[PDB]
Point group: C4
């Protein structure tokens, strides 16, 4: 009866455990994780970094002010010039650190030509400042631009159907584009998922078996404007070959459907997924047409996308029987 | 007689309606939309964000100035130090907010060490400032760099022709590069569009049928320097197999041509398209050569690109007849 | 005798003329051109933009200062507050414009709360400022990162050779990686270039004919660490099938070799090219091995890369003859 | 006995020498190198650039201050206005240079309307400033984002095994994903590495021979969630065809395994590698299942990933013998 390996939203149902090296391997790939975490976390993270550099330098400057004796003479006089003007304490040293690294530079607190170490520190802090910004930009740039978001404007039919097209019995499901932007170099893939035991007695917890959508003839490549109906012809080499309408309400297995393509604007490949259980496949049905001609253009009614209608003319046996039977009649 | 599913510019003629979830699905993919809108909109949008953060913080600062009693003593004295110097009112609080977030920091209005909340607010606003900038950069970066713009320096012939090459009857159309930059890993695809009814009585509003350009042999991949003429050999497995010159002025259908490749500079796939109606296909014609040798290099005259000439030697029947007839003569 | 369509550096020898729409099509694709121009031009271009916005706003501010009467009272007094402090003339108005847009904000020239138009202008200029920066970043980012630069660390043999390998006569040329960085998902392509006339009497100025490197079997995909020798087996379906050693010093044609792959760091496809004329192909030679085992690793001597040695055992006739002859001996 | 061409981490064991043009070819591709060097080097490099521009301009400003006579009158008076206020010497000129290029602009040192050359210099320095930043961003952006880092969250089995599946003798190794992020458009490749001599007596130091993973049928493409076991069927066309269990402890050769795919977030192809020596291949073993059903989802125990168990039922001869023998029994 259960269960489902890929959910309908495409989300995969599985978890990794006892991975061992996970910590040290994630440090090297660390950038990859950083961009998948919630915004608030990536942000708080960066503000944490800012805050830390501001405090660090602030301390240096305050230390410098303390030792130089600026805390007691922040503004100096004819006989005395402070390292950095107007640093009277911690908060003052803090403010100056921020003003410097942010490049606001109000100027009320200001470096003088006196201390080479203060000057140096400012130099270092400036450079540092650029570095952190650069990381933030890249991170934000990257995360903002993730192509997996496009998979949410792509659509699969809630069900898959089996039915005759041009003398052949075919498993079909539908796909559609919810944006007027194109999916470039798009193509599809399908797989039958279920556990099995090889004739040698080897148990495969879940075997993934290719469902042929026409890859060989280059037919898995699609041009997607209006919703396309995807066809798997069930034949000798099909994993569904010996399955009939009654085997559908009995058998336990899963079909996984994939759509890969490039977001038109960024040319970044996105991968959309969904799944049909044997109990989500409608035998003897056909998809309702979503496309019609309004005279000087075409329109797509998306409310008909998921809808199917009964075709009582449809055979209830397997392709296998269907074929075999043909060769009794034709054989006699 | 009508109509056309893809226009000649490649623009697709169709519209989506009754999409349902459109709003909630567009929010998750929201970045994808943001980059396709007109510049002025993306910009005004960002300036809207800036303006909003400036006003927001300005209010905070003004509120802080008001309560602290700075509005009445903006410059302070020996006994009194304001939260932020020189904020006498709304506009002053506004100016300071901008100066801070932009990092101009003229310094006439300046934070003091007095209020931790003012200090904090400045901290927050600074961080915020970086965040908005980062988004703007990414957005601008992205939109500026869109690869679909390259499709406008790529070219299709205004017409397609049918004619004999090396003993075979072929549908041909032409493609060309208008930049001296290359289209990397380029390849082509073709499809016949028209409504049809399966032998089972199923209506397909528009069926998309592959036109073989040599995909199987890897011949759909092209190296495009000078204009290339693309050939579809019309044979047993061709959708045009049973079509003759007279069927061209009668029949209603459409041929869709695609060119996919990578912009040399960004290596981002662009997809160019165009279309030929049965009435835009010239039977019995041939393309005028645009390439000639000037002795130590080659030149392309692009004014000859679209031009075709009559070949009266050309057969007016279908490949089907042509073949079948060959097997009467050779059969007798 | 001449000439060469692709030079040895990969540079293509051809020019486009009479393109017509070139100007209006380049405006839409305008970004693509901007990144291919020399640095100095892209830079001067941007500094031109900066300079133009600084001058524009400077004028506005100066106009505002003039009308308000600030030019005569730049510092104001108890009874008079200028729009922007310390603007006494053109250069002053200019300096302030720059200080504002650059966010330096020394603060000597500073906006006051008086003029909403000055304030507004500052607002506008700030926003504008960000916009130009963003473009510069993207442009610089893009151009700096162009993948076509990697093609200069990729290498082709100065000559191609023909010779026997495992009982088959093969055209071979060599390729090599000059960086320890990998070329990801790399593959090769070859083509024979030369003008020809179809049996129908149609002249093709230059026909491009695929040279099979094993694409069908997936053998055109290579893993390139040490230099690889690329093999074209000359057989029935080869365009070189009927060519012998003597036809090489006579015939005029060209072979074009391509290597496509992804720069490991940016995963951006680069395309490297080179060319062999019939007179650059060495019949009866073999490449000198550049790889040898030094015991706990391997080394590549690149000075042997281009070198070839004579194999007098090599047949001087065409594959065609070679085959045909085999079937006399075996036929008698 | 030795040695290994690709290490187990994927690192390649080889070195390039006598490359000749290496310096001039690396200058054109210079960006590619810059991003592979250690952070500290790329950073120090950039800080070097900053420091150099600060010093350069500082000198100009100091020169200008010197000649104008500002060094003796940094603050000016009613009758005298300095080029740049408050530059009394070298360090002062330095500080101002930094303040300007960084856009901090404290304002204590400030340009006046007096010198057009000082003004000009500031203009130039500002523009320059933007330029360097832009490069730093791009560099940091790029390097931070390198897709080769993802290959460290991808996994190969420590050993490869040979064993029967569904009546066929197969070489198998395992692959797994250590992140819950997907590897998009992933596919695999395998190759047998070893030196050989063609029947013509030509020595190939290392020949790379394709191991068929199902490329022809499109089966080399995988959907990787849980660890997949990769199968090479050993048959007539297999390079391992004539190899038996005893040939494994004798022969010296290497098998190289590759996994190519796209980092889900950036859609940038990464290439992962590893290697199995004839002595790292376990004949007669089978992989321990890492996947099991916990009722409403699936889990992967990664500690079982590398583990194999003995299958005494396994034949010790080559596929060749195995086949040939079948045709004695069936032949008699
Ligand atoms: C002030 C700072 C406010 C602040 O810290 O975050 C607010 C907001 C919400 O982010 P938030 O923390 O809710 O993070 C996202 C949230 O979990 C969504 O529900 C996820 O969408 P989905 O359900 O997985 O589809 C999304 O997944 P993914 O994107 O990680 O995959 C998460 O990133 O972040 C912005 O959008 C940009 C704001 C820019 C200003
Ligand atoms: C001052 C602010 C002035 C301002 O707000 O915009 C002006 C200008 C025009 O932009 P605009 O609003 O006209 O937006 C573009 C306009 O619709 C074009 O005609 C479209 O080209 P096409 O016909 O579809 O090919 C283009 O399509 P797409 O690009 O969206 O696909 C639109 O983006 O924007 C800049 O170019 C960058 C200026 C940077 C300064
Ligand atoms: C001060 C401003 C100085 C300034 O304006 O440019 C100097 C310098 C030279 O640039 P330059 O004007 O010489 O432009 C490059 C020059 O033509 C090279 O010879 C070309 O290489 P190749 O022969 O085609 O391989 C290259 O081709 P492509 O790259 O266009 O294809 C051209 O871009 O530019 C920088 O490198 C970055 C400097 C950052 C500071
Ligand atoms: C203060 C300045 C401190 C400073 O200069 O660098 C510190 C730190 C270390 O960098 P570091 O110099 O150690 O450089 C990396 C180091 O060699 C790693 O061990 C390498 O990893 P792997 O073993 O090859 O996997 C990595 O290889 P690749 O990445 O080059 O391939 C090297 O880049 O750099 C940051 O991470 C970003 C810090 C941002 C702040
Ligand atoms: K500033
Ligand atoms: K200032
Ligand atoms: K600033
Ligand atoms: K400032």
């Amino acid at each position: 009866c259960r269960n489902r390996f890929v959910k309908k939203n495409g989300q995969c149902n599985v978890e990794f455990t006892n991975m061992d090296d996970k910590p040290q391997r994630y440090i090297a790939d660390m950038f990859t994780t950083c961009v998948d975490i919630r915004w608030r976390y990536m942000l708080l993270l960066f503000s944490l970094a800012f805050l830390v550099s501001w405090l660090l330098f602030g301390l240096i400057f305050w230390l410098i002010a303390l030792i130089h004796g600026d805390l007691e003479n922040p503004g100096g006089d004819d006989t005395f010039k402070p390292c950095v003007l107007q640093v009277n304490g911690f908060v003052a040293a803090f403010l100056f650190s921020i003003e410097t690294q942010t490049t606001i530079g109000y100027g009320f607190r200001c470096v003088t030509e006196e201390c080479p170490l203060a000057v140096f520190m400012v130099v270092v802090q400036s450079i540092v400042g650029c570095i952190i910004d650069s990381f933030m930009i890249g991170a934000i740039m990257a995360k903002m631009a993730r192509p997996k978001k496009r998979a949410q404007t792509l659509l699969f039919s809630h069900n898959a159907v089996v039915a005759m097209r041009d003398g052949k019995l075919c498993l079909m499901w539908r796909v559609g584009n919810l944006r007027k932007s194109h999916i470039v170099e798009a193509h599809v893939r399908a797989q039958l998922i279920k556990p099995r035991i090889t004739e040698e007695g080897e148990y495969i917890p879940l075997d993934q078996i290719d469902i042929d959508v026409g890859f060989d003839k280059g037919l898995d490549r699609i041009f997607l404007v209006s919703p396309i109906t995807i066809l798997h012809e069930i034949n000798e080499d099909s994993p569904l070959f010996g399955i009939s309408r009654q085997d559908l309400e009995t058998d336990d297995f899963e079909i996984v459907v994939i759509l890969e393509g490039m977001v038109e604007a960024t040319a970044m490949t996105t991968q959309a997924r969904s799944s049909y259980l044997a109990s989500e496949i409608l035998w003897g049905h056909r998809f309702e047409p979503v496309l019609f001609e309004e005279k000087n253009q075409y329109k797509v009614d998306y409310s008909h996308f998921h809808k199917t209608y009964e075709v009582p003319s449809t055979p209830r046996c397997s392709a296998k029987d269907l074929v075999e039977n043909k060769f009794l009649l034709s054989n006699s």
